[PDB]
Structure 1
Amino acid sequence: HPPAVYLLPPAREQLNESATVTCLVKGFSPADISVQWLQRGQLLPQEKYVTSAPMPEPGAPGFYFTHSILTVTEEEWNSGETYTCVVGHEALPHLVTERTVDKST
């Protein structure tokens, strides 16, 4: 069962500071999964994001769930650049699925 990926932008709240971009990954098994992030199609280094170890998905026995949370500056977020959450998983025929967001999202 491949992961479903939902990528949420930071809150609209006008930042003066860090912006948080949130990648929710659910409905997958086995628990083995990879998550990386892009800015403008380029790999961001690990230090900018944190990915939770997969845990059993609440409300879905047999499946797991992880969050990956990217921190960027308000300026980096408000530049209008595209951010991509890239998820690798063995159930995907093309091995990977991704989502993208940007300040307009």
Structure 2
Amino acid sequence: PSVFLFPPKPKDTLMISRTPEVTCVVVDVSHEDPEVKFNWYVDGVEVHNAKTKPREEQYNSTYRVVSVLTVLHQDWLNGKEYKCKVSNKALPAPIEKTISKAKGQPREPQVYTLPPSRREWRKEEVSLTCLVKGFYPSDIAVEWESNGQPENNYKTTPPVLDSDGSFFLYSKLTVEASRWWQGNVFSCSVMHEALHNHYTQWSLSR
């Protein structure tokens, strides 16, 4: 079989109501020896403490077993390393795969909101756009909200390498011309590692 390790999603590591989760999937375990054993090393330390939890089954005449390891918000941010040992009988000698924060030199993203072009003002649907430039690591959380409730019709591009050894992106919230001109205000919310408070909100009004 083959092993893949995945980082916590980037809104899990900075919010207080979520639990960050490194998940370890195995993909090609046969119908012959489909038993799996997940041994988690945190920086050489062995962790059944943080409850790992395999709970999954197969497809494609194979077996896809994933293992989720709860982590602490701080430890993921403080460079701690997380290993995963998988002990299946088809494979010769155990597979160990690693994952860590991002190494790197953190970079604070500048966040600017951009009112829609005047060529789409008197259409049916304006497009508010919010650009975050100059961040590192490549992992951010861009969402929109308006009047304390979420907004759900917005699409963020991928992060893009700059020549400044940092990343940018654009999120575009499409909202009806009705609400734009009602005076309603919509906000761009960025969660990043390197922000003070991990958080910033910038408003697009009038």
- Give me the TM-score of the superposition, normalised by structure 2: 0.46
- Residue 89 of structure 1 corresponds to 192
Distance in structure 1 (CA, Å) of the matches to 2:196 and 2:114: 25
1:12 aligns with 2:95: no
Structure 2 unaligned regions, length at least 5:
1-106
- Judge conservation of contact 1:41–1:84 (CA < 8 Å) in 2: no
Question: How large is the Cα RMSD of the aligned pairs?
Answer: 1.2
- Residue 22 of structure 1 corresponds to 129
Match of 1:43 among 150, 154, 157: 150
Deviation at 1:3, TM superposition (A): 0.8
State the AA in 2 paired with 1:3: P
State the AA in 2 paired with 1:18: E
- Residue 68 of structure 1 corresponds to 171
The share of aligned pairs that are identical, in percent, is 40
Give deviations 1:62-101, integer Å, cap 9, x for gaps: 1000100010000011110111000000111301112101
Structure 1 unaligned regions, length at least 5:
none
Give deviations 1:33-87, integer Å, cap 9, x for gaps: 0011011121112xx1110110112x42x10001000100000111101110000
Runs of 4+ displaced beyond 2 Å = 11-14
Deviation at 1:11, TM superposition (A): 2.2
Distance in structure 2 (CA, Å) of the matches to 1:93 and 1:74: 34
Give the paired residue count. Answer: 99
Distance in structure 1 (CA, Å) of the matches to 2:194 and 2:123: 42
SS in structure 2 of the partner of residue 69 of structure 1: strand
Greater gyration radius? 2
SS in structure 1 of the partner of residue 133 of structure 2: strand
- Give me the TM-score of the superposition, normalised by structure 1: 0.87
State the AA in 2 paired with 1:86: S
Deviation at 1:15, TM superposition (A): 1.0
1:100 aligns with 2:203: yes
SS in structure 2 of the partner of residue 7 of structure 1: strand
Higher strand share: 1
